[PDB]
């Protein structure tokens, strides 16, 4: 579960997706998605 300010999943990232519970998961950029 990706921690806050944890790149939580832009094109191509198939690491940790799920942001913990708090966060959101914000796609900020085509790549750069970010958990706050
Ligand atoms: C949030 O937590 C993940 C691991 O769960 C880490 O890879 C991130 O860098 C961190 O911000």
Same mark, same amino acid.
Request: net charge neutral.
């Given at each position: &579960? !990706? %921690?806050?300010? #944890? !790149?939580?999943? #832009?094109? #191509?990232?198939?690491?940790?997706? $799920? +942001?913990? %519970? #708090? &966060? &959101?998961? !914000? $796609? *900020?950029?085509?790549?750069? %998605? !970010? +958990? *706050?």
């Amino acid at each position: &579960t !990706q %921690s806050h300010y #944890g !790149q939580c999943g #832009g094109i #191509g990232y198939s690491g940790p997706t $799920v +942001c913990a %519970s #708090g &966060t &959101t998961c !914000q $796609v *900020l950029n085509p790549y750069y %998605s !970010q +958990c *706050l």
